[PDB]
Design a protein around this ligand. Sequence first.
Ligand SMILES: CCCCCCCCCO
Ligand SMILES: CCCCCCCCCO
Ligand SMILES: [K+]
Ligand SMILES: [K+]
Ligand SMILES: [K+]
Ligand SMILES: [K+]
Ligand SMILES: [K+]
Ligand SMILES: [K+]
Lengths: 103, 103, 106, 106, 219
Amino acid sequence: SALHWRAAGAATVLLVIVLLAGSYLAVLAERGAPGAQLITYPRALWWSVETATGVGYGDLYPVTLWGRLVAVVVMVAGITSFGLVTAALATWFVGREQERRGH
Amino acid sequence: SALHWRAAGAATVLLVIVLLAGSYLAVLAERGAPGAQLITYPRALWWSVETATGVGYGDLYPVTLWGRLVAVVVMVAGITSFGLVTAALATWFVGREQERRGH
Amino acid sequence: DILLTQSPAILSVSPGERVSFSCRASQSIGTDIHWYQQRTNGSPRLLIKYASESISGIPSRFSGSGSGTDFTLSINSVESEDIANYYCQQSNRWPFTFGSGTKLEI
Amino acid sequence: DILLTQSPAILSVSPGERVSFSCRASQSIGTDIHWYQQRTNGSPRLLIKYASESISGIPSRFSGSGSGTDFTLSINSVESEDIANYYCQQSNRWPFTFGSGTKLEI
Amino acid sequence: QVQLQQPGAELVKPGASVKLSCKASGYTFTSDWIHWVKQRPGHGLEWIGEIIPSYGRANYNEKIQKKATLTADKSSSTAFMQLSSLTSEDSAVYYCARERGDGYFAVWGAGTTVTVSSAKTTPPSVYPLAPGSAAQTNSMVTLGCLVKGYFPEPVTVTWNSGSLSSGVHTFPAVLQSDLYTLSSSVTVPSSSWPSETVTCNVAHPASSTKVDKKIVPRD
Ligand SMILES: CCCCCCCCCO
Ligand SMILES: CCCCCCCCCO
Ligand SMILES: [K+]
Ligand SMILES: [K+]
Ligand SMILES: [K+]
Ligand SMILES: [K+]
Ligand SMILES: [K+]
Ligand SMILES: [K+]
């Protein structure tokens, strides 16, 4: 296994950790704030996923400072992970095209 | 430090500047328009981040022409910055794979 | 905060007859409502979770329905052991809140 | 624009008794409500910000609660210095608006 | 096994403070929240606050005056509620409940009856209630126990250590001169008494006393 496929795997594992920790911390941050909906773990996890994927339906979102800071970490982890996968795919294709051209 | 890691760092710093200036200008543009919610700085900043990351929960959005123009700049700055990071990661992986193959 | 209205406060029914308790939320809360039973001098007891989901150990004559703002707890053929106070509770928005409660009479 | 209803306009209470002022918004405004006190011939004075957040220099007997459309300012054990007019104000949507005010009597 | 264990009662003087406990057992997760609910006699359930033991953070009902302070001990799996500066308005049953972080209260405690009063603790006197010599009997016979002069509430009256539940009802206590009094009724087949023993069990957790009283025919 080369570097790019290693970093991609690591980013995927790390993303899973961020989703789980993010769901836990979001509930912890949002409870205590009147009107907050991000307050139970199952839907918090669903919120984490759609935050990391950038979909953001808007059915759930943080209203507190720390809940929003947690969200930012989830967003960045998502953008970085999927960005790291795209870069890895590009490296794979560049290398294969390099061999195909006999260089 | 090579070019790609330099541009990535510059894009990150520039993005931070856009988020701050964007939050300030959004409030300035949205105040004066009845029904506007993007009118206080703390949540405007949160709006800027979720705009730059493309998440867009829909809890906050501009309703004025200039507020929307500001939003467009924030979006593009976000897409460009994270796009510049992905390109930098790809260059890093291509270079390392190049060495791994002894070329 | 979310207000849960339970009316009527008292429900009189004949033995073996179907009864329905109502719970109305001050705003839309999907299906995040839960039902509890409290007999005289007893502690509350979960009957239905998430509006309609049954609980292990709870008689099949207990059921729930509704979504949004209007929720209903139903008892098929009321028997003597069902005499108690019935409370609804929401978990959609913080803080959790309880309804005022409905007493069942036979 | 957002209308803030304060009823009743006058609240009579006995000394040492807990009192509660109500503020109702014409639409949902989260927790973007703020409370001010204005004594006779005085300027308004911030008591509570963002529905429930306490302010430095303000006696601990002053508290706030609520979210969405229904908000409450409370005073634990009303004393003579609390005699004033009480206004709520929203910052959720432009323009900012004030409630009609509630007068406290002892 | 009982997942949530609370003390039966606590007597508090006006102005004093008390710390209620709630020892948890069964499955425990990092996503567990412990809640506290206040119920005044004749009234409904009122949410007080919550705490997450795995982190120690607590949240409180903003709509009411904060007289509670929640803490937890991970080593003993016990939750605590510190009630301070109590008045008669604070006299109620306080339940603790466990939520698996999914919004509903799966299990509740038995409840701790808190009485705020200046009066002194008094254990109950239990007297037997057997029919008089002239009383005729049908297929059933009615016996009883007189639990008189105790403070504060509550008392728990069982018959034959719980084995005799059917045909049993205990009346609400009456208050007079800072002392409570109630009776408990039991109805068994006439042929079964007194050949098969009948004994009431009166527990008064406020004074940590539990007494028995065998019901025998009048001499
Ligand atoms: C990254 C932030 C960790 C979660 C912080 C908990 C916030 C406590 C709420 O007052
Ligand atoms: C890029 C736009 C700068 C902000 C313009 C302020 C708009 C004035 C509102 O009438
Ligand atoms: K996207
Ligand atoms: K999106
Ligand atoms: K919407
Ligand atoms: K979106
Ligand atoms: K959306
Ligand atoms: K939406």
